[PDB]
Amino acid sequence: KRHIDQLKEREYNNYSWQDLVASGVVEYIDTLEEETVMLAMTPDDLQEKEVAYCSTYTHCEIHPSMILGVCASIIPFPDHNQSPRNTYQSAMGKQAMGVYITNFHVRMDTLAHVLYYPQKPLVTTRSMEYLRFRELPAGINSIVAIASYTGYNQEDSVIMNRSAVDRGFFRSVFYRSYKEQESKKGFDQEEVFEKPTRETCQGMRHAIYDKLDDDGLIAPGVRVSGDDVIIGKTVTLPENEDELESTNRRYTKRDCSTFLRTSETGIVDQVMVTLNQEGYKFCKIRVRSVRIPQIGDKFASRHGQKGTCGIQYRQEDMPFTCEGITPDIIINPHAIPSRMTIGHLIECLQGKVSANKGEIGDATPFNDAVNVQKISNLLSDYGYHLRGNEVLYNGFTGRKITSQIFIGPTYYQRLKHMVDDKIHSRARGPIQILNRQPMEGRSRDGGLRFGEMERDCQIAHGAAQFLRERLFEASDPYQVHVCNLCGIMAIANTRTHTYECRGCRNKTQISLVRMPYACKLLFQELMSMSIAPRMMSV
Amino acid sequence: MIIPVRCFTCGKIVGNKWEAYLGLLQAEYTEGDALDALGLKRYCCRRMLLAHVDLIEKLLNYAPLEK
Amino acid sequence: RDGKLAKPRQLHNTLWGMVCPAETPEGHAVGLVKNLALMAYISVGSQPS
Amino acid sequence: MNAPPAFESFLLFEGEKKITINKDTKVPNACLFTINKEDHTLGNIIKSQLLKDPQVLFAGYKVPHPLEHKIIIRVQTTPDYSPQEAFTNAITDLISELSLLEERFRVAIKDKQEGIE
Amino acid sequence: MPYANQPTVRITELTDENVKFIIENTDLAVANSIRRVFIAEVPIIAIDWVQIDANSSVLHDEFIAHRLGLIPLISDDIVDKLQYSRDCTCEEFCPECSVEFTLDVRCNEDQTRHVTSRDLISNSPRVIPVTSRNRDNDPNDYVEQDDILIVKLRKGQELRLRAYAKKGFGKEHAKWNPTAGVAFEYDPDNALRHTVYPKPEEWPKSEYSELDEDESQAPYDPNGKPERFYYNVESCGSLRPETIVLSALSGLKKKLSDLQTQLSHEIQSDVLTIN
Amino acid sequence: QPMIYICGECHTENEIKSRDPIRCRECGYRIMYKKRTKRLVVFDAR
Amino acid sequence: LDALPRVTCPNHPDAILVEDYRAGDMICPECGLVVGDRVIDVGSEWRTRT
Amino acid sequence: FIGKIPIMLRSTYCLLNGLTDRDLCELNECPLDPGGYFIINGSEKVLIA
Amino acid sequence: SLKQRLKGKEGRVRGNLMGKRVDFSARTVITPDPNLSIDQVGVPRSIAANMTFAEIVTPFNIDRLQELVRRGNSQYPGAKYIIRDNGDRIDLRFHPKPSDLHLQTGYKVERHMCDGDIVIFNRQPTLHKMSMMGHRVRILPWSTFRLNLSVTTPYNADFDGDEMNLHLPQSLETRAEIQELAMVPRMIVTPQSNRPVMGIVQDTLTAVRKFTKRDVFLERGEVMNLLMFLSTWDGKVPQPAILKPRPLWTGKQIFSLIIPGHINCIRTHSTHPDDEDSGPYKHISPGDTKVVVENGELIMGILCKKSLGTSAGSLVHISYLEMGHDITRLFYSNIQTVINNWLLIEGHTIGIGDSIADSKTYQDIQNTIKKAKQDVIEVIEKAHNNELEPTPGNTLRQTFENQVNRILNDARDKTGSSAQKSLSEYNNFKSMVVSGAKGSKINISQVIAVVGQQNVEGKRIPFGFKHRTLPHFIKDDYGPESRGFVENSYLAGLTPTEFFFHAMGGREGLIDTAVKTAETGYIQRRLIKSMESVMVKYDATVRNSINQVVQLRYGEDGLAGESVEFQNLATLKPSN
Ligand SMILES: [Mg+2]
Ligand SMILES: [Mg+2]
Ligand SMILES: [Zn+2]
Ligand SMILES: [Zn+2]
Ligand SMILES: [Zn+2]
Ligand SMILES: [Zn+2]
Ligand SMILES: [Zn+2]
């Protein structure tokens, strides 16, 4: 115990951990050594001789929690919870949004999510201090009531208080940093940062350079949207091949001015210009955007019970306690027992009493504290039902609800799952004429994928005509003329007069067929292999 | 961080009672007495303040807070 | 890679105190991906001579 | 946002009307009225106010959807007593009670300029 | 109608921050709805327009602007007098539908400077501003009545901004809500048995339970009806709680009268006749 | 437009409409900052 | 049908043919008729021994 | 001269390793950013075990 | 490589024909909406702003259609484009006089997508015919899809963050085609296993159990309140179930109101209560527990899922047969609305109280474990004496490992059975388990009493630590903990060692799941590529793509599997 006092002496003077290593009261141990050692679980119980089945112990664990990793260390009493849920939490914890360092201002990463009002866990594991988690929390301990309500919280979701959202519930900033470089494009050809006018340049399709400055860059603090040109630059190409007068003010000034993707809206956060090892002049600009909780956005409990916001209601509509306390969240009861997440209740029960105590409880799974009854007995002492269950009044009729409610505080996660970034749709737009397929995706405003199995279902559906609409009309429509003499697709077709099938001397017996254009290409591809496939109704 | 006015659970103001609490802590090493003095008779309000944390001072620790 | 099929992933008991059992991705890389224990350490190599 | 502004919850468009009146096409001396930009909060006292009336054969209400701001009320009274009078009677009675509640509140608060003890 | 409640009223306790009272002879639906009125329904003035002229502080304008919302403006000047900016047909805003605010601070001092509501001034005619040593030329301040610390400034940081306070109500946004949690209680003995309360000893007694105080674990009456609602209004500071109640009571009546007028209009606009 | 960003490390506006190679007086560093926008900007308190 | 380059209509010789990258459409405002064709948009394709 | 070797953050040769938090904030560095991963072309890079 | 380009490896076949992109489609995250009719789907306004339909002008609606053109792109109830008979299309956003623009019958107008329109909705991944269904749109705020709970059931969707895909047909044939086939109401019964696919679940299922309680009583005021919730109602108030001392209605009376008035489903209460028969026959005191409804009126019986659906003898299947999909869908939407509203006011929760049992039994349970612990030692010592008798056809070790396993199972079962007894019927957990929701007795054992033995492939935890599992154990240890037995409860917590064994098994479930997830996609592909060659013919004979006969008739009867039902022939009666 005196050595502990030495460890205490170290806070001021010195007594290194290495000296503790030098003390040889503890040693560092590999698995090969473990095979031979007689390891002890705990100093206390194992030293007892009264029931000493063995006393040949050689070494003992510092604490069983040392097995745990960074993620597992966060959730209290994991053993009262189903084991995979913790792995799901370990993954989902990684998925949560939050702060990450101190100097966010100097930082200009492509993507970031930071919470306005983070909170250290009301119930904490002591090691999280070493994890500096209380320094950098990634959620808040919200007070939740467990009730099905209207079923809008069914299956991995929750109903939340909109009026709480008004107070600043889980609201967050989103920062995206844009970077852009200027550089050569040949011996003479190069990009040129500027603010070109619509007549002094081409390749501008339709977008205007109003936001720009003469430098070609937008000013900091400017309101932005998913269409306008964010960085202005243009590259003349031939310098001499244009010659003689097809002059125009656009000349050969081809546009290469950077614009924002057709989705984001917001304000310009920051603009920074410098140069690199490549030597080329380049600029970096940070764009600020605000993330607010919305219906359907993904959220999660500290106990691996994730859920989306099923809906949001005003505080008045919400059912309320004797005080009129509306919970921050309304979780479906049934989601817990199927997953068997009792620990989730312990955060609430420990949190409730800690809040009343006005003092933090430790979240170490292994204790002698007797958290069950003693806390419950203590919960009764603050003047509450010893089990935590409490009656609440109706949000609409005001009447007391038939069942009693278990309500209390809980550490919650805002997950990296912007639903508005997940949505995608199109009815018509840019295609891929090379195959006549829709564009690659949302960042190019493309169409949505059609899979082999939707086809397989569609055959099983028997609705051939809908597939036909989908395969042909909703993706690849084409018209072809064939010679009556031969199923070979051969025409010159004056698309205002003649048609003809050269090699067959066809002058009138032309016929029209409807097939996919991509399919016609495949067929032309067969002909390039010297194959002459042909086709008729006869 | 930067103590939000009004307890999310109720609406109880605390736009200056953080530093006062910090004052209360320096004056009295009894959180209960501190928490009580602030008038936060409700534990929802207590959780608000108890679980609050203010890193800004570390942010302030930087010198390059000029441009 | 080398040595495949009829080998899989589950867990080894000696991993106790060496790796957190819960700390793994829920993807196909589950168990295939491991994570350092809270107080585990790695040998740097020395000369016994 | 892909969601309407907050005032839209209560504010009506220039083409909207607060309430719509329809007769029932199913049973005699009955009608179904639709109220726009309103909730059960109003609905419940009025149902109760009508329920308090013994001349009422039927009275009931619902939003078409909680997200939606609209309610519909079905009411049936005795064939000699129109459902319109019942709604009119219920509101006038209720408003009158509220005024006295306010006045007694005024009397109750006024009744301690200093202290009750 | 032949019969209605007498809405018995009794006021128990009142302060500038809270009011406790007991209402009797009334419907539960009326009690909850008026309760819902206390929060959402009450009209208030709050900031809706903010321009930030300069900010060399660490926080970003939108953080402060959200905070400017979070500021608890007192409403003790009949804020209802101002017309709504939408209806005031004025170019976006005017003093008849807006108040103006301006804040300018610069930290030339080497030590960290603190910014407060006081740095923000009502440029519009002095309708009662933020509650920061303006109401309290009273030897009864909390500790300073510096109510809100806007931000802190280390040497070299500056903040220039403008604000417009505008008319609104709690239903619009919580910042316009002049009330915190609202206390409410009826029938503590659970004679109505709205819920089981298995083993009533597991349920501590409510302060109102204390009245009929009882050791019979919960007396019962099947014929009972909700009565003697116990109230305790908790104002957020924006207005004196009882005065909030009157404005709430006035508003709900007005809300109903307009529907009656519309109800007359429904029968006017209709082909129906009544007399 | 008098604006032009400001150097990062000397923390000083260069301030001109020039195609100069992002240089900076006294402070040789290339890190540039651009002034706040000179525009009307409304903010809500929501 | 050689008169393309960017301006023609059946009712009038087109004066302007704006390219709406957003919808990927070609519009001729002064009358009202998609000249048809969005070739895959150059504004979509503006991110792109011896 | 033989080369320029990319160095791990918080290395012995990462001279910031001796500086205080206050020094690091003076450098606009995060005191709770121990590093241990390279920065390559301005991008952060970590070796997987 | 020219062959390669074709070959399929991202070629013309696999990389183009087998999978491509399409238009008139949307995908988002899913959100719940029990208030939605089974045909409804909630749809984001932005999507609705994005989605359009090109309608051909008819003189009956041309004036309205012109208003959409006049309303234009500047609002949702307007139109973006018009496509003329000759083929010309017009952008109304840049048109100089959108309102003044001429139009006639036979022209097509691209108007915005509107509500009441029928769309086709799909899961991804797609596994069966109900995985793609026609749906009715509902235009709503926020970019979320809202759906009826029971539509989740065939979809197996989870609001944890699943996306699913929707497609909007642009042809009237297909609109009919989707309406006559792809629509969900026809999808109710599966031909794969002649059973219904719909299923009311969780909160709804639990409140229904709660609602069938004998102690359920209603007030006249609330009956009117309940009546308005009805999606349909006769307009005629029912007679009170009680008149004196005071007028009252029963929940069974009111549930029976929900029920269509000339159809019945009999007996399958399918709940634990009563007595695996024999007992309830004692004496036909035959009510409450067992389910019985007559003339659309429920006589007695707490409800279950086997009653509620996705099983034989279900009310859902017979309603589909008699009332048809259309009446059954409206009944189903209606019941969910009502039960939801009752649940909302009735309420339901869960707490540590639900984990509370009797101390003495809890004391007896541990002591039951102690005897079992003692029972294991008796088995260990005899084997160590080699006086233990090996089981015939097995080794002594196989006997020993088997013998310890029966004990660890008997004790856990005994202590579990004590916990089943120890819980009140008042409990939400027992309520949740009984209702047929996501729970069971084994859960109670695990949460309250004991998780039980952990195993590897069914075998006790192997001696990976040199004839040991851990250095905390002695060498040659054979204790159940030394081999993964989790004696504690989720309430009791777990030892460091037990948690690890618990973590290990969680991997086994998870790894198997990931592997199973990839393989099913592949096996199916092998399956589909084979079975795609066959279809039914008009001569009833089953034939292939080259018209050859597979069967004389499909299933040797030519009848629909959905019209098949489980029946007892009973002609195999014992005595002649
Ligand atoms: Mg799922
Ligand atoms: Mg689910
Ligand atoms: Zn030919
Ligand atoms: Zn509070
Ligand atoms: Zn005005
Ligand atoms: Zn410089
Ligand atoms: Zn034209």
Side-chain angles (χ1 to χ4, degrees), chain B residues 61, chain H residues 15-27 29-31:
Chain B
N61 193 25
Chain H
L15 185 58
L16 289 75
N17 68 69
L19 298 180
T20 64
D21 40 12
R22 215 246 259 153
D23 295 314
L24 290 170
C25 68
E26 194 172 359
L27 295 185
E29 177 67 26
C30 177

Side-chain angles (χ1 to χ4, degrees), chain E residues 26 28 31 66 80 115 120 148 158 165 186 197 207 215 229 238:
Chain E
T26 183
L28 177 61
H66 179 22
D80 188 33
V115 183
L120 183 70
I148 171 178
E158 310 193 23
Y186 67 98
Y197 291 117
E207 52 181 359
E215 235 67 54
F229 313 90
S238 292

Side-chain angles (χ1 to χ4, degrees), chain I residues 208-408:
Chain I
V208 165
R209 170 188 166 270
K210 203 188 196 195
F211 194 56
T212 49
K213 191 180 179 50
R214 294 290 294 176
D215 292 339
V216 172
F217 297 91
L218 292 74
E219 56 178 351
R220 176 174 130 115
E222 202 69 83
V223 166
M224 289 186 181
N225 206 342
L226 285 158
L227 286 171
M228 196 73 189
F229 303 154
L230 298 175
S231 302
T232 187
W233 185 53
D234 62 346
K236 184 188 171 293
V237 182
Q239 189 165 356
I242 304 187
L243 281 73
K244 289 195 66 60
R246 158 181 308 110
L248 296 173
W249 290 255
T250 69
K252 291 186 152 75
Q253 189 184 13
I254 304 302
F255 171 79
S256 302
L257 305 179
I258 317 177
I259 308 179
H262 62 75
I263 186 171
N264 303 325
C265 189
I266 43 161
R267 319 324 165 77
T268 54
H269 66 95
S270 303
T271 59
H272 183 50
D274 241 26
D275 169 69
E276 227 334 88
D277 274 49
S278 255
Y281 297 151
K282 281 177 186 286
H283 333 313
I284 306 304
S285 288
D288 230 36
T289 62
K290 299 193 173 181
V291 159
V292 48
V293 43
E294 298 207 335
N295 202 30
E297 205 174 346
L298 178 62
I299 320 192
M300 294 300 293
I302 187 169
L303 261 66
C304 76
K305 179 184 174 186
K306 198 164 278 155
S307 11
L308 189 55
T310 334
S311 307
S314 59
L315 180 59
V316 71
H317 191 248
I318 64 171
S319 294
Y320 183 108
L321 296 171
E322 271 38 82
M323 297 294 168
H325 68 88
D326 197 17
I327 299 181
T328 306
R329 73 165 292 278
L330 184 55
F331 168 60
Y332 261 142
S333 294
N334 198 30
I335 190 172
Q336 287 171 316
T337 311
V338 175
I339 293 294
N340 196 90
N341 284 284
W342 191 69
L343 175 58
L344 170 62
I345 55 175
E346 196 68 16
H348 179 274
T349 60
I350 189 171
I352 297 299
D354 298 285
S355 304
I356 303 302
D358 168 69
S359 289
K360 290 181 176 178
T361 308
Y362 159 88
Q363 183 61 272
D364 182 52
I365 282 166
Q366 55 166 46
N367 294 341
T368 306
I369 302 303
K370 297 174 191 169
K371 289 164 183 171
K373 281 170 159 166
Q374 291 186 300
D375 274 346
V376 168
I377 292 163
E378 197 199 344
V379 177
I380 294 172
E381 188 162 7
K382 289 179 180 177
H384 281 331
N385 297 343
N386 204 22
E387 63 181 350
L388 196 157
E389 180 184 9
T391 292
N394 296 305
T395 69
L396 201 165
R397 297 185 190 300
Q398 288 161 22
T399 306
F400 176 89
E401 64 173 350
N402 178 66
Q403 283 298 111
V404 301
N405 182 56
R406 67 191 285 165
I407 304 165
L408 271 47

Side-chain angles (χ1 to χ4, degrees), chain B:
Chain B
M1 291 299 300
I2 194 67
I3 41 160
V5 194
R6 296 174 75 175
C7 172
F8 299 158
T9 317
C10 58
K12 199 186 166 57
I13 60 169
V14 67
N16 66 334
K17 303 305 183 177
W18 172 231
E19 290 70 10
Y21 174 78
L22 294 177
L24 292 176
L25 298 186
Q26 196 55 66
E28 181 71 18
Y29 300 128
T30 305
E31 285 84 342
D33 207 354
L35 290 168
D36 212 348
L38 292 169
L40 280 55
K41 306 301 191 287
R42 288 307 177 116
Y43 74 80
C44 66
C45 307
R46 288 301 172 81
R47 160 195 67 127
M48 201 59 66
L49 216 175
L50 176 59
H52 186 272
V53 56
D54 198 40
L55 195 63
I56 195 170
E57 299 306 305
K58 313 310 300 196
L59 176 57
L60 286 162
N61 193 25
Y62 295 71
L65 288 170
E66 56 203 335
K67 298 284 175 49

Side-chain angles (χ1 to χ4, degrees), chain F residues 7-12 24-29 31-32:
Chain F
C7 174
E9 299 87 340
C10 68
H11 300 97
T12 59
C24 177
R25 60 184 184 284
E26 69 264 355
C27 181
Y29 299 138
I31 295 297
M32 296 298 123

